[PDB]
């Protein structure tokens, strides 16, 4: 009873597990429409793609994030009742706290700490037979994130803290044991950080003004009250965990360098401009965030479709980032496409669209870019290495997707 | 005043632990009364026995089940706040859900799956030195129950899941370590099944209409709302666990065939009619459910006893099944006593009395009988085996009870 | 307001309290020449005091309350959540009478005698062992005796685990990091273990005996006649079992005192119960255990030219008061003879609290602690001879609680 | 007879001391108490050092050898595994005693 296409399959959630990052795109292509209806994740939903749909998706008067996604994502990736599900001035108030910790001075400090760690790892890498970049990245990022945040990290817990952080990320689009590893990792990380929050509030743990642990421990909401120690820990996890999740992008950028070697000498000849272009294309080209979920706040009409209050809407991030209407040859890795490109908040949304200060767009975008640029500079200039025979293939069905090998490296030598 | 027999001892709960299935009958015999007063399980109680008392016990205007038993039974056998403690229209509404899953077609299906599994196990049994029927029964029943319910069950977890189910059953009448194993097994099973409920509601787990997992996940109460995912998991476990608990009756059936071999050829020359009589006598003769607890809902007088509102009342299941006024030679195993016998809902109550549709009587009675008939048919026609030297003794003080050896078999060969 | 009252203005005072421990308050009362100073401690603006006169005001229940006084960390490790230590008013007195009813002189005598038989039985094994750690031996014996006297079943294969969980809770009350987390994990294990007992008892499924701690906690009724929650009843029973095991600290300090002051061995041997009580009291006064106590100002009042505002945190220095030269001549010296002909006072000797135990929060186990210490000291003096080999007997005044590092390891043990 | 008397008197002291522990226990298995007491008494009388944290495992190893002499299968294999552990544990004592590094 509508001109809006309707997928009437009742197993669509299971097909989403089968198709992953291509579920919405396969159907927007099939139905010749930027939007279609489908029962997904237990809700009658509308899936939409494209920059114009992203513009509507980020209209906070038309869309809310509360109760948008199933509880399984909060219990694994986000944390229960955290910022991802907040709306109104309360969300903006808490969003300002996250943004205050991810300013360019923070981005520069984090990238510089990573540069030091990469250079120091060379002396052990030269003595190893093989090195898995994903494993080295997750442990370096965990060590750097905690140090930069004032979070104590003993050397005997680095691997278990980093694995717990990655287990949460690796579980957001999974069922069965991969999803359960994140469900068990989250309570350990929350208990671990909440103790620091309580010790800090009693003065029994030294904190430093301007760092994430201190600002989370002593942040006050709009009513002047502090966050519950568990919520303060959860929101600190929403800083430490995604910094470790940069490991995925670091492996993808290394895979892109390997699969497209002409950009290797192109990066050496250039400077930070060419590294940023490469890093932006890594974020646009490779999969990470599949889609975003929202609920319709008030009845409205857009693109000849009636959005009723309460219906779930999913915005295809991967499809928008591979839209031929916005990107020429979208399925090709071409860093040159970002040369002299005007800033657009809705055609490139691997970490969200719109304004971070007025919406749910990722505030760690700058940190992600600067850490990637520094890690790319290290791979290009500091060391030479072989990429031995391995399964470099990554599955689009799997969410999040990662090359099975993890970019194993051998024959590592300093330049 | 009452002037009804009164056991004035203060350690009666400890005496119930040492006398078990005979505690109520020892005192009804001693007091020459169908009922007596006593302080049991921390409550001033009245124990009663006989079919007439069973008729009164199942008057839902006179009796309720809410708050009738200590919390220890919920936290081990039943689950907290499940069907066993419900009253009124809400209980009948949930009771219809269970009954819809245990109709004769379900009984036939479960019995047929059991036959197929028994026959396949012969190849393994012929190669083994000894086989413990109890351990084989619980694992087969667990795999058959989960497959029939639509509950996924990996081969690497069949033993643990079946052990967790049996631990809950083996703990309902225990104190100390035996009871604690059921207190620890219950949260494991609830968490295991609850994940399935939430995954099914999100469409991420395939379910099939008419199976237990589906019907529990999408059952709606009187107000049209579905159960909490934990409640739905608890009530699904109230289907899976008692199916595994049939292992007790299967072991007792083999013990009856061994201790009274005159019935082996009697069953051989007979058919389903003789298997019914044998299976029914196994349920009447051997102990399983000791007694049932209820609370007096309103003041009433029965058998010259004034039942005050709120007092605890225990109905002797075991003693009623061995009542010489209802069964000739009640302490003898005589399957022929069920030859062309009319339906009586209160003289034979090993799995409750009254109407299962209008009360708390076990809805799995038909499933239990049909699975027992199939397993008995298998032991009689399909294999020959030795019963080596073992302790086949079972204690009437241990609740639940089981032959100590578990009817270990050897020399197994197909026929 | 209180600009005259001295004021430590450091922002890291909670961290300095961790590194100074039992000496944090005395260092500043000596520094400021005052029984009173202000400081931000444990996340609250506080006033620290010391001396017998300060203790008198601290135990004025109209001026001070215990609810919300300490951080929740102490409840989650030592006390238990919402237990007797944080209660005020008639409800506190009611539950306090329950504890006192289990720690009367008949209970003190029973526990002390149970200790004596266990010490004597241990000699047979001690003679066959190369070395014996008194701290490890005490906590096991104290746990076995406390559970037996309380009616708490204790399997032989769980004695070490239960005793370790009790000490983990005690050893964590003044710590941060791993040492504190051990108590944070031990408490749920102990609470769950005891709560099943409370549930089985209330159902008649576990035998209890009137007059024993397990029975009295399981069937204690509040002012409104209702029973405690099964979890709360277990928590308060642990507030009896655990502190009995905690006597292991005092037992090691007593043996440390005999070794470090050998002249009192013959003094005790040539004496009787009088000299043992004097030695035991001096062990409690001289050695550290209870650092300070916390309370909230119940209502506005003025004392010692200081304005106490309702809600402000106040910490009473137990250690410093016990070493106050105004009350004890040569206070930093172990002199058991100082307790001969000592007038009984409720505010100058406060290692386990001050005031009246029946009208305040003073430790009701003081009598049990003394009687068990006397019997243990009697055994160490008359029953056995032993060597104290080379070991680290040092105990840090910054570590809360404190213990000689070795735990007074003994060797060459033989009967007398 | 002097060695017999000494071992019996050591046993007597151990039985008497055990009563304090037995009075607080719900149950006591005589076989398990006898094997541990005998192991401690035998080692002490022999001059063999025996830490309290190893009494159970040393006594278990001793009984495993005895309980295996007329058995086949797992019961016999327990003794076949306990013997190398006990032989190695005692040969180190012989080694140290002959070097004067263990008091005898
Ligand atoms: C590895 C690279 C990253 C990717 C692909 C990514 C992606 C995303 C996506 C898709 C969202 C949801 C956006 C929305 O709802 O509109 C998000 C939100 C968020 N991200 Fe990231 N992110 C990354 C790195 C980071 C880092 C390193 C941090 C922390 C320093 C971070 C912090 C956050 C926070 C706090 C939010 C919630 C923002 C809010 O709800 O207002 N992210 N991110
Ligand atoms: C092994 C044989 C079994 C025995 C001895 C047994 C016995 C009992 C007893 C004594 C009750 C309590 C009756 C009452 O309160 O009046 C009961 C209830 C119940 N049984 Fe069974 N049962 C058996 C098998 C099963 C099986 C195989 C299932 C599931 C397929 C099952 C499902 C239930 C349920 C759902 C209830 C609760 C009914 C209600 O409260 O309305 N039982 N059973
Ligand atoms: C025999 C073992 C012990 C038992 C059963 C015991 C019991 C208790 C109880 C029940 C309380 C709470 C009283 C209240 O809040 O009203 C308490 C408080 C206290 N106990 Fe003990 N105790 C024992 C040994 C000790 C020892 C050896 C010390 C030495 C450090 C000690 C020091 C304290 C302190 C400082 C308080 C707090 C006093 C206050 O808040 O005013 N106790 N004890
Ligand atoms: C099939 C399950 C449904 C899929 C749920 C998708 C969850 C949307 C959020 C994805 C954000 C990307 C995560 C990057 C790492 C981080 O920021 O923690
Ligand atoms: C300590 C006294 C016992 C407490 C009262 C026991 C009441 C429960 C009786 C239920 C018998 C049937 C249990 C087997 C089937 C199942 O798994 O549910
Ligand atoms: C940050 C320092 C903690 C504050 C001090 C908390 C209470 C100190 C006094 C209690 C000492 C009692 C310890 C032995 C008895 C017991 O086990 O309760």
Tab-separated table of N, CA and C in Angstrom, chain B residues 159-267:
chain	number	residue	atom	x	y	z
B	159	UNK	N	27.480	-32.797	26.838
B	159	UNK	CA	27.726	-33.339	28.170
B	159	UNK	C	27.531	-32.276	29.245
B	160	UNK	N	28.077	-31.078	29.027
B	160	UNK	CA	27.952	-30.015	30.021
B	160	UNK	C	26.499	-29.589	30.193
B	161	UNK	N	25.781	-29.409	29.081
B	161	UNK	CA	24.389	-28.977	29.164
B	161	UNK	C	23.526	-30.024	29.856
B	162	UNK	N	23.716	-31.301	29.508
B	162	UNK	CA	22.958	-32.365	30.158
B	162	UNK	C	23.295	-32.455	31.642
B	163	UNK	N	24.574	-32.291	31.990
B	163	UNK	CA	24.966	-32.298	33.397
B	163	UNK	C	24.335	-31.134	34.151
B	164	UNK	N	24.309	-29.949	33.536
B	164	UNK	CA	23.683	-28.798	34.177
B	164	UNK	C	22.196	-29.039	34.411
B	165	UNK	N	21.516	-29.655	33.440
B	165	UNK	CA	20.100	-29.965	33.608
B	165	UNK	C	19.883	-30.952	34.749
B	166	UNK	N	20.706	-32.000	34.816
B	166	UNK	CA	20.539	-33.016	35.851
B	166	UNK	C	20.925	-32.458	37.216
B	167	UNK	N	21.944	-31.595	37.262
B	167	UNK	CA	22.342	-30.979	38.525
B	167	UNK	C	21.188	-30.208	39.153
B	168	UNK	N	20.417	-29.485	38.335
B	168	UNK	CA	19.258	-28.767	38.854
B	168	UNK	C	18.232	-29.728	39.440
B	169	UNK	N	17.971	-30.839	38.747
B	169	UNK	CA	17.003	-31.812	39.239
B	169	UNK	C	17.522	-32.491	40.500
B	170	UNK	N	18.778	-32.936	40.477
B	170	UNK	CA	19.359	-33.656	41.604
B	170	UNK	C	19.527	-32.795	42.851
B	171	UNK	N	19.140	-31.521	42.812
B	171	UNK	CA	19.387	-30.607	43.917
B	171	UNK	C	18.129	-30.147	44.643
B	172	UNK	N	16.933	-30.500	44.159
B	172	UNK	CA	15.726	-29.892	44.717
B	172	UNK	C	15.452	-30.360	46.141
B	173	UNK	N	15.917	-31.549	46.512
B	173	UNK	CA	15.671	-32.050	47.851
B	173	UNK	C	16.929	-32.209	48.678
B	174	UNK	N	17.968	-31.450	48.347
B	174	UNK	CA	19.281	-31.625	48.946
B	174	UNK	C	19.692	-30.399	49.751
B	175	UNK	N	20.671	-30.614	50.629
B	175	UNK	CA	21.420	-29.546	51.273
B	175	UNK	C	22.896	-29.806	51.009
B	176	UNK	N	23.699	-28.759	51.164
B	176	UNK	CA	25.127	-28.876	50.989
B	176	UNK	C	25.550	-28.921	49.533
B	177	UNK	N	26.662	-29.611	49.257
B	177	UNK	CA	27.239	-29.562	47.901
B	177	UNK	C	26.298	-30.027	46.803
B	178	UNK	N	25.460	-31.032	47.071
B	178	UNK	CA	24.529	-31.504	46.051
B	178	UNK	C	23.541	-30.414	45.661
B	179	UNK	N	23.066	-29.643	46.640
B	179	UNK	CA	22.137	-28.558	46.343
B	179	UNK	C	22.841	-27.402	45.645
B	180	UNK	N	24.103	-27.145	45.999
B	180	UNK	CA	24.805	-26.002	45.424
B	180	UNK	C	25.145	-26.220	43.956
B	181	UNK	N	25.327	-27.475	43.535
B	181	UNK	CA	25.579	-27.746	42.123
B	181	UNK	C	24.401	-27.307	41.264
B	182	UNK	N	23.177	-27.478	41.771
B	182	UNK	CA	22.014	-26.975	41.065
B	182	UNK	C	21.868	-25.471	41.150
B	183	UNK	N	22.320	-24.868	42.254
B	183	UNK	CA	22.285	-23.414	42.368
B	183	UNK	C	23.272	-22.756	41.417
B	184	UNK	N	24.360	-23.448	41.080
B	184	UNK	CA	25.325	-22.940	40.115
B	184	UNK	C	24.956	-23.287	38.680
B	185	UNK	N	24.299	-24.427	38.460
B	185	UNK	CA	23.947	-24.826	37.102
B	185	UNK	C	22.826	-23.969	36.533
B	186	UNK	N	21.905	-23.512	37.381
B	186	UNK	CA	20.750	-22.763	36.889
B	186	UNK	C	21.130	-21.453	36.208
B	187	UNK	N	21.980	-20.589	36.780
B	187	UNK	CA	22.338	-19.358	36.055
B	187	UNK	C	23.071	-19.624	34.753
B	188	UNK	N	23.853	-20.702	34.682
B	188	UNK	CA	24.527	-21.053	33.437
B	188	UNK	C	23.517	-21.390	32.348
B	189	UNK	N	22.514	-22.206	32.684
B	189	UNK	CA	21.506	-22.586	31.700
B	189	UNK	C	20.623	-21.402	31.326
B	190	UNK	N	20.289	-20.553	32.301
B	190	UNK	CA	19.443	-19.397	32.020
B	190	UNK	C	20.144	-18.415	31.091
B	191	UNK	N	21.408	-18.102	31.382
B	191	UNK	CA	22.180	-17.224	30.508
B	191	UNK	C	22.342	-17.833	29.121
B	192	UNK	N	22.559	-19.149	29.060
B	192	UNK	CA	22.719	-19.832	27.781
B	192	UNK	C	21.455	-19.730	26.935
B	193	UNK	N	20.291	-19.933	27.552
B	193	UNK	CA	19.042	-19.922	26.799
B	193	UNK	C	18.552	-18.496	26.552
B	194	UNK	N	18.789	-17.575	27.493
B	194	UNK	CA	18.317	-16.204	27.317
B	194	UNK	C	18.927	-15.561	26.079
B	195	UNK	N	20.212	-15.821	25.824
B	195	UNK	CA	20.853	-15.314	24.613
B	195	UNK	C	20.098	-15.785	23.376
B	196	UNK	N	19.618	-17.030	23.397
B	196	UNK	CA	18.822	-17.542	22.285
B	196	UNK	C	17.508	-16.784	22.148
B	197	UNK	N	16.892	-16.422	23.276
B	197	UNK	CA	15.622	-15.701	23.235
B	197	UNK	C	15.811	-14.334	22.590
B	198	UNK	N	16.815	-13.582	23.049
B	198	UNK	CA	17.058	-12.254	22.494
B	198	UNK	C	17.499	-12.333	21.038
B	199	UNK	N	18.337	-13.318	20.701
B	199	UNK	CA	18.750	-13.492	19.312
B	199	UNK	C	17.561	-13.842	18.428
B	200	UNK	N	16.643	-14.667	18.939
B	200	UNK	CA	15.450	-15.017	18.176
B	200	UNK	C	14.546	-13.809	17.981
B	201	UNK	N	14.404	-12.978	19.015
B	201	UNK	CA	13.572	-11.785	18.898
B	201	UNK	C	14.166	-10.782	17.917
B	202	UNK	N	15.492	-10.733	17.807
B	202	UNK	CA	16.145	-9.870	16.832
B	202	UNK	C	16.217	-10.493	15.445
B	203	UNK	N	15.615	-11.663	15.244
B	203	UNK	CA	15.696	-12.358	13.977
B	203	UNK	C	17.053	-12.933	13.646
B	204	UNK	N	18.029	-12.821	14.548
B	204	UNK	CA	19.377	-13.311	14.296
B	204	UNK	C	19.532	-14.797	14.588
B	205	UNK	N	18.495	-15.445	15.109
B	205	UNK	CA	18.489	-16.885	15.327
B	205	UNK	C	17.234	-17.451	14.685
B	206	UNK	N	17.413	-18.398	13.769
B	206	UNK	CA	16.277	-18.997	13.081
B	206	UNK	C	15.450	-19.830	14.050
B	207	UNK	N	14.155	-19.537	14.121
B	207	UNK	CA	13.211	-20.328	14.891
B	207	UNK	C	12.110	-20.837	13.973
B	208	UNK	N	11.428	-21.885	14.424
B	208	UNK	CA	10.368	-22.523	13.656
B	208	UNK	C	9.092	-22.526	14.481
B	209	UNK	N	8.026	-21.956	13.918
B	209	UNK	CA	6.723	-21.943	14.570
B	209	UNK	C	6.322	-23.346	15.007
B	210	UNK	N	5.741	-23.438	16.202
B	210	UNK	CA	5.322	-24.709	16.748
B	210	UNK	C	6.358	-25.427	17.586
B	211	UNK	N	7.606	-24.968	17.584
B	211	UNK	CA	8.638	-25.531	18.443
B	211	UNK	C	8.757	-24.712	19.725
B	212	UNK	N	9.382	-25.323	20.737
B	212	UNK	CA	9.387	-24.732	22.072
B	212	UNK	C	10.142	-23.407	22.102
B	213	UNK	N	11.311	-23.346	21.456
B	213	UNK	CA	12.086	-22.107	21.454
B	213	UNK	C	11.293	-20.962	20.838
B	214	UNK	N	10.626	-21.221	19.714
B	214	UNK	CA	9.823	-20.189	19.068
B	214	UNK	C	8.641	-19.784	19.940
B	215	UNK	N	7.879	-20.765	20.428
B	215	UNK	CA	6.662	-20.455	21.170
B	215	UNK	C	6.957	-19.744	22.486
B	216	UNK	N	8.092	-20.044	23.123
B	216	UNK	CA	8.461	-19.324	24.338
B	216	UNK	C	8.983	-17.926	24.037
B	217	UNK	N	9.672	-17.746	22.908
B	217	UNK	CA	10.240	-16.442	22.589
B	217	UNK	C	9.168	-15.434	22.198
B	218	UNK	N	8.086	-15.887	21.566
B	218	UNK	CA	7.061	-14.987	21.052
B	218	UNK	C	5.705	-15.191	21.718
B	219	UNK	N	5.657	-15.914	22.833
B	219	UNK	CA	4.438	-15.994	23.626
B	219	UNK	C	4.101	-14.625	24.203
B	220	UNK	N	2.820	-14.272	24.169
B	220	UNK	CA	2.333	-13.040	24.774
B	220	UNK	C	1.418	-13.377	25.944
B	221	UNK	N	1.501	-12.574	27.000
B	221	UNK	CA	0.688	-12.791	28.188
B	221	UNK	C	-0.713	-12.230	27.955
B	222	UNK	N	-1.512	-12.155	29.023
B	222	UNK	CA	-2.884	-11.675	28.888
B	222	UNK	C	-2.935	-10.226	28.420
B	223	UNK	N	-1.977	-9.400	28.840
B	223	UNK	CA	-1.937	-8.006	28.416
B	223	UNK	C	-1.316	-7.822	27.036
B	224	UNK	N	-1.052	-8.908	26.312
B	224	UNK	CA	-0.505	-8.823	24.976
B	224	UNK	C	0.995	-8.643	24.896
B	225	UNK	N	1.677	-8.461	26.021
B	225	UNK	CA	3.122	-8.296	26.027
B	225	UNK	C	3.809	-9.648	26.168
B	226	UNK	N	4.984	-9.764	25.557
B	226	UNK	CA	5.738	-10.999	25.683
B	226	UNK	C	6.520	-11.014	26.991
B	227	UNK	N	6.943	-12.210	27.387
B	227	UNK	CA	7.700	-12.359	28.620
B	227	UNK	C	9.069	-11.709	28.483
B	228	UNK	N	9.613	-11.266	29.617
B	228	UNK	CA	11.013	-10.871	29.655
B	228	UNK	C	11.872	-12.011	29.128
B	229	UNK	N	12.975	-11.656	28.464
B	229	UNK	CA	13.828	-12.678	27.865
B	229	UNK	C	14.315	-13.682	28.902
B	230	UNK	N	14.470	-13.250	30.157
B	230	UNK	CA	14.881	-14.170	31.212
B	230	UNK	C	13.748	-15.117	31.586
B	231	UNK	N	12.533	-14.581	31.747
B	231	UNK	CA	11.375	-15.428	32.022
B	231	UNK	C	11.146	-16.432	30.898
B	232	UNK	N	11.264	-15.984	29.645
B	232	UNK	CA	11.091	-16.889	28.513
B	232	UNK	C	12.144	-17.987	28.524
B	233	UNK	N	13.383	-17.641	28.874
B	233	UNK	CA	14.421	-18.654	29.006
B	233	UNK	C	14.115	-19.601	30.156
B	234	UNK	N	13.601	-19.063	31.264
B	234	UNK	CA	13.284	-19.892	32.421
B	234	UNK	C	12.188	-20.893	32.076
B	235	UNK	N	11.168	-20.454	31.337
B	235	UNK	CA	10.079	-21.363	31.001
B	235	UNK	C	10.465	-22.339	29.897
B	236	UNK	N	11.384	-21.954	29.010
B	236	UNK	CA	11.921	-22.923	28.061
B	236	UNK	C	12.731	-23.993	28.782
B	237	UNK	N	13.474	-23.600	29.819
B	237	UNK	CA	14.203	-24.573	30.625
B	237	UNK	C	13.233	-25.469	31.385
B	238	UNK	N	12.054	-24.952	31.734
B	238	UNK	CA	11.027	-25.793	32.336
B	238	UNK	C	10.407	-26.765	31.339
B	239	UNK	N	10.870	-26.767	30.095
B	239	UNK	CA	10.561	-27.820	29.136
B	239	UNK	C	11.757	-28.739	28.928
B	240	UNK	N	12.943	-28.158	28.726
B	240	UNK	CA	14.124	-28.951	28.402
B	240	UNK	C	14.587	-29.775	29.596
B	241	UNK	N	14.706	-29.141	30.764
B	241	UNK	CA	15.217	-29.840	31.943
B	241	UNK	C	14.371	-31.044	32.342
B	242	UNK	N	13.038	-30.963	32.421
B	242	UNK	CA	12.281	-32.157	32.827
B	242	UNK	C	12.327	-33.278	31.802
B	243	UNK	N	12.506	-32.964	30.515
B	243	UNK	CA	12.713	-34.020	29.525
B	243	UNK	C	13.986	-34.791	29.842
B	244	UNK	N	15.054	-34.077	30.202
B	244	UNK	CA	16.284	-34.747	30.605
B	244	UNK	C	16.069	-35.516	31.904
B	245	UNK	N	15.169	-35.035	32.765
B	245	UNK	CA	14.889	-35.701	34.032
B	245	UNK	C	14.183	-37.039	33.859
B	246	UNK	N	13.702	-37.357	32.653
B	246	UNK	CA	13.133	-38.676	32.397
B	246	UNK	C	14.187	-39.766	32.571
B	247	UNK	N	15.473	-39.394	32.551
B	247	UNK	CA	16.549	-40.350	32.799
B	247	UNK	C	16.313	-41.149	34.074
B	248	UNK	N	15.770	-40.501	35.107
B	248	UNK	CA	15.477	-41.203	36.353
B	248	UNK	C	14.482	-42.331	36.122
B	249	UNK	N	13.394	-42.040	35.403
B	249	UNK	CA	12.383	-43.058	35.142
B	249	UNK	C	12.906	-44.153	34.221
B	250	UNK	N	13.783	-43.803	33.275
B	250	UNK	CA	14.341	-44.810	32.377
B	250	UNK	C	15.239	-45.785	33.128
B	251	UNK	N	16.022	-45.283	34.085
B	251	UNK	CA	16.860	-46.164	34.891
B	251	UNK	C	15.998	-47.073	35.758
B	252	UNK	N	14.962	-46.510	36.391
B	252	UNK	CA	14.054	-47.320	37.195
B	252	UNK	C	13.345	-48.371	36.351
B	253	UNK	N	13.033	-48.048	35.094
B	253	UNK	CA	12.394	-49.022	34.215
B	253	UNK	C	13.312	-50.208	33.954
B	254	UNK	N	14.581	-49.937	33.639
B	254	UNK	CA	15.535	-51.021	33.433
B	254	UNK	C	15.744	-51.821	34.712
B	255	UNK	N	15.762	-51.141	35.862
B	255	UNK	CA	15.883	-51.846	37.134
B	255	UNK	C	14.682	-52.753	37.375
B	256	UNK	N	13.482	-52.282	37.028
B	256	UNK	CA	12.291	-53.109	37.179
B	256	UNK	C	12.356	-54.335	36.279
B	257	UNK	N	12.807	-54.155	35.034
B	257	UNK	CA	12.962	-55.286	34.125
B	257	UNK	C	13.981	-56.290	34.649
B	258	UNK	N	15.018	-55.811	35.337
B	258	UNK	CA	16.046	-56.698	35.866
B	258	UNK	C	15.573	-57.432	37.114
B	259	UNK	N	14.910	-56.726	38.032
B	259	UNK	CA	14.498	-57.322	39.296
B	259	UNK	C	13.249	-58.184	39.171
B	260	UNK	N	12.499	-58.055	38.078
B	260	UNK	CA	11.289	-58.842	37.842
B	260	UNK	C	11.315	-59.353	36.407
B	261	UNK	N	12.157	-60.352	36.120
B	261	UNK	CA	12.346	-60.786	34.725
B	261	UNK	C	11.141	-61.487	34.123
B	262	UNK	N	10.140	-61.858	34.925
B	262	UNK	CA	8.957	-62.515	34.381
B	262	UNK	C	8.195	-61.623	33.412
B	263	UNK	N	8.415	-60.311	33.463
B	263	UNK	CA	7.720	-59.371	32.597
B	263	UNK	C	8.433	-59.133	31.273
B	264	UNK	N	9.688	-59.567	31.141
B	264	UNK	CA	10.410	-59.377	29.886
B	264	UNK	C	9.747	-60.148	28.751
B	265	UNK	N	9.463	-61.435	28.975
B	265	UNK	CA	8.748	-62.214	27.970
B	265	UNK	C	7.284	-61.806	27.886
B	266	UNK	N	6.707	-61.352	29.001
B	266	UNK	CA	5.338	-60.851	28.974
B	266	UNK	C	5.219	-59.631	28.070
B	267	UNK	N	6.244	-58.776	28.064
B	267	UNK	CA	6.257	-57.645	27.143
B	267	UNK	C	6.588	-58.096	25.727
